[PDB]
Design a protein around this ligand. Structure first.
Ligand SMILES: *[C@@H]1O[C@H](CO[C@@H]2O[C@@H](C)[C@@H](O)[C@@H](O)[C@@H]2O)[C@@H](O[C@@H]2O[C@H](CO)[C@@H](O[C@@H]3O[C@H](CO[C@H]4O[C@H](CO)[C@@H](O)[C@H](O)[C@@H]4O[C@@H]4O[C@H](CO)[C@@H](O[C@@H]5O[C@H](CO)[C@H](O)[C@H](O)[C@H]5O)[C@H](O)[C@H]4NC(C)=O)[C@@H](O)[C@H](O[C@H]4O[C@H](CO)[C@@H](O)[C@H](O)[C@@H]4O[C@@H]4O[C@H](CO)[C@@H](O)[C@H](O)[C@H]4NC(C)=O)[C@@H]3O)[C@H](O)[C@H]2NC(C)=O)[C@H](O)[C@H]1NC(C)=O
Ligand SMILES: *[C@@H]1O[C@H](CO[C@@H]2O[C@@H](C)[C@@H](O)[C@@H](O)[C@@H]2O)[C@@H](O[C@@H]2O[C@H](CO)[C@@H](O[C@@H]3O[C@H](CO[C@H]4O[C@H](CO)[C@@H](O)[C@H](O)[C@@H]4O[C@@H]4O[C@H](CO)[C@@H](O[C@@H]5O[C@H](CO)[C@H](O)[C@H](O)[C@H]5O)[C@H](O)[C@H]4NC(C)=O)[C@@H](O)[C@H](O[C@H]4O[C@H](CO)[C@@H](O)[C@H](O)[C@@H]4O[C@@H]4O[C@H](CO)[C@@H](O)[C@H](O)[C@H]4NC(C)=O)[C@@H]3O)[C@H](O)[C@H]2NC(C)=O)[C@H](O)[C@H]1NC(C)=O
Ligand SMILES: [Mg+2]
Lengths: 214, 262, 215
């Protein structure tokens, strides 16, 4: 039983923002690593809910730094197909494999839940410092695929971090996004907006604003 | 009398604890009914047969082996290391001269199985095998010098320790001279040279030179180092290239194109 | 039919952050050996604090796992300041299925410690229409990421909370948020809640910030 050996396959979902904006192009990406020079030919078969499709684009072999080849096949997906839970299967055939390798991916199952989005001004204790933290609390959403952005006056904010989604006790997820801004910009009354994109929101987004006001 | 020569069977200079290896003392004078002197790190070994067999290696077997038979000179040392580990990078020699083949093996403790093996030189994996396989480099050169190790997948991914291999250069790029003057009055005696010399003490080794024009020949592989057209008409003008190589051709090197104007 | 190369593997774990920061608690280093065969189950530990060997270790009894292997564990109590000063702890494992003893070492995360800034954030006005309500503790600017955050009220631990993992901030320090969920009746009745943070860069390794309905 020396079946052991040969390439490996990793199948990756689309970016959450790409499934939610009809503008953007969501893709599932099938990556084959540990392809040898002796057996370099890789064949991809793609199936959507069991029925084969033929519109995937395969990039050419790329020699990695460990002297193995890496081959990638990118399948463009329909927004609604992914969001409706259709399964995406990648089947990889190569002479060094005793049988093709099959990987299947899909959206997480379960009834979607709308996030609640709450913006929180900086703590008064933080106003003594040169930069303040603007906080966007996003809770109660399912599945955990989500995208959060900050903007002000039609331009993106250059300085925010967002925690990973964290499982809450009710089965839903929550996260926080911390926008950092100069104290002067906050005290001068600029408006800052938290934009949250999630499939369970109307038009796949909501946004809440935050500005200094006494 | 020439020197004795030690040979390892298997040829690997590093083995695992409790593994077996046989040392062969070869003398070109083939003797009969004559003893063999074996030395571990200068100390004489209580074994006098023409081969010396280690049945189950241990740390006490590591060091320099030398041997001597009859009226031969004592051999150059072979260094045997005994190791413990998951994986052992075995090499056929630790030092080589350009052109001499190098053999490599990614040896698994107790001959267990690994797959998806990588061979590394100086931190970078240069060769990948789905099934564990030895690796031989026939035309070695200086760039094959470095630290070698390997890794493979068993129940987990295991990695061997490093071992150093030096591939010594034999002669540099045979640069081509320019006799005096370029440009020149045609009707002037030529003299052209090929600038390379040996770096190792090879007693009777002879290098063979050959001078080029563009691509077509002038003088083939000859033991003399200088091309000398009697006195130059600039038909023999323009591209000039030299090539120096061993008699077997397994080490050959280039040179810059000579500005020639007669 | 040759078998795959391999034997036991060793994983070596650091103490809980709270244990190293509170002198009243006992921090420990844990050496876990997995994939111990049934044929060769004898495992031997040797511990070394900054090179010097120690003998105060304790090895729990074996426990079979569903994959029909054993899992022996060896626990070594460590001195608080020895760990905080950056001394390294080494576990050495011996077994007949190993070609040589396995050695693992851990130590405190290296890097200049940075003091945490702790801020409590009341519930958003728009959340005050819900039955439950979110109290938020922002901890930012700390290094290393080893930290402990808890909530309490009226001397009693509030445990209906979640804390995000540390997140690397754009200045090389870490931050996180902790979210405590409480009934809106408790919040509007004026009860005080407190976020307690323990970190090696804080004075006395401890700070706390409180939160309550201001007017
Ligand atoms: C030889 O080299 C190759 C090449 O590697 C590179 O070069 C070498 C020399 C080194 O320098 C190396 O460091 C370099 O990376 C080696 O190939 C690697 O092989 C390993 C396995 O041996 C692979 O490891 C898996 O990685 C997965 C995550 O990969 C992503 O993240 C890493 C960094 O974190 C990136 O480096 C990868 O490239 C992947 O990055 C993702 O790529 C996607 C596709 O492009 C991106 O998505 C797309 O993005 C575009 C935008 O451009 C669009 O948006 C598209 O729409 C979108 O689809 C994506 O953004 C990007 N992400 C990031 C973060 O960048 C791991 O997931 C995986 O772990 C799983 O499997 C393990 C089994 O091996 C298991 O141990 C894990 O637990 C985990 O198992 C999963 O567990 C979950 C539960 O949590 C289960 O639910 C799952 O079912 C289960 N899955 C499986 C399959 O079991 C692996 O760790 C590595 O990815 C790969 N690198 C590359 C570059 O391909 C090779 O190994 C070397 N060979 C030898 C012999 O040494
Ligand atoms: C056969 O079965 C056994 C049993 O497995 C278990 O049993 C059955 C039921 C199975 O169903 C199985 O699913 C179960 O898990 C298998 O044994 C397992 O083997 C795997 C490896 O094959 C081990 O995987 C490593 O895990 C490390 C972390 O594990 C912790 O977290 C998981 C859950 O997240 C737990 O399950 C673990 O038990 C660990 O949990 C820790 O437990 C400690 C208890 O001793 C706690 O410490 C102590 O706690 C006490 C209180 O009890 C006190 O507080 C003490 O003071 C304290 O010291 C500790 O708090 C607790 N933590 C948590 C979070 O719960 C990973 O770190 C490790 O990954 C490293 O290595 C990988 C490859 O080796 C590599 O890919 C990774 O990248 C990573 O590498 C590290 O990367 C980081 C960066 O992220 C670097 O900084 C590091 O330097 C780098 N290090 C290294 C060495 O590379 C592994 O994934 C698994 O833990 C183990 N399980 C158990 C229970 O022991 C066995 O594998 C099976 N065999 C086969 C063939 O399948
Ligand atoms: Mg809740």
């Amino acid at each position: 039983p020396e079946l052991l050996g040969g390439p490996s396959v990793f199948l990756f979902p689309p970016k959450p923002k790409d499934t939610l904006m009809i503008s953007r192009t969501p893709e599932v990406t099938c990556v084959v690593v540990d392809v040898s020079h002796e057996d370099p030919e890789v064949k991809f078969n793609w199936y959507v809910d069991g029925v084969e499709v033929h519109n995937a684009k395969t990039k050419p072999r790329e020699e990695q730094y460990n002297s193995t080849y890496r081959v990638v096949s990118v399948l463009t997906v329909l927004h609604q197909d992914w969001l409706n839970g259709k399964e995406y299967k990648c089947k990889v055939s190569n002479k060094a494999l005793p049988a093709p390798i099959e990987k299947t991916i899909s959206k997480a199952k379960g009834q979607p839940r709308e996030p609640q989005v709450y913006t929180l001004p900086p703590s008064r204790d933080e106003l003594t410092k040169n930069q303040v933290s603007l906080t966007c609390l996003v809770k109660g959403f399912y599945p955990s695929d989500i995208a959060v952005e900050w903007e002000s006056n039609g331009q993106p904010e250059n300085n925010y971090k967002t925690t990973p989604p964290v499982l809450d006790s009710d089965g839903s997820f929550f996260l926080y996004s911390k926008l950092t801004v100069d104290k002067s910009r906050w005290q001068q009354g600029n408006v800052f907006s938290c934009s949250v994109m999630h499939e369970a929101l109307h038009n796949h987004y909501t946004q809440k604003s935050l500005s200094l006001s006494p | 009398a020439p020197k004795a020569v030690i040979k390892l069977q298997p040829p690997w200079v590093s083995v695992f604890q409790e593994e077996s290896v046989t040392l062969h003392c070869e003398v070109p004078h083939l003797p009969g009914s004559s003893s063999t002197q074996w030395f571990l790190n200068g100390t004489a070994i209580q074994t006098s047969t023409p081969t010396y067999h280690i049945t189950s290696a241990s740390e006490d077997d590591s060091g320099e082996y030398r041997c001597q038979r009859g009226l031969s000179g004592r051999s150059d040392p072979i260094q045997l290391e005994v190791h413990r580990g998951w994986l052992l990078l075995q090499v056929s020699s630790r030092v080589l001269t350009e052109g001499e083949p190098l053999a490599l093996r990614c040896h698994a403790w107790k001959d267990k199985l690994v797959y998806n093996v990588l061979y590394y030189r100086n931190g970078k994996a240069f060769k990948f095998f789905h099934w564990n396989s030895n690796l031989t480099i026939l035309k070695t050169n200086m760039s094959h010098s470095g630290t070698y190790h390997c890794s493979g997948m068993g129940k987990r991914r295991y990695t061997s320790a490093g071992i150093s291999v030096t591939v010594k250069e034999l002669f540099p790029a045979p640069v081509l001279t320019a006799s005096v003057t370029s440009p020149l009055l045609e009707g002037t005696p030529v003299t052209l040279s090929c600038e390379t010399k040996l770096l190792l003490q090879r007693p009777g080794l002879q290098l063979y030179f050959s001078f080029y024009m563009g691509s077509k020949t002038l003088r083939g592989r000859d033991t003399s180092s200088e091309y000398q057209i009697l006195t130059a008409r600039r038909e023999d003008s323009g591209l000039y290239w030299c090539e120096a190589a061993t008699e077997d051709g397994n080490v050959l090197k280039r040179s810059p194109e000579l500005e020639l104007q007669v």
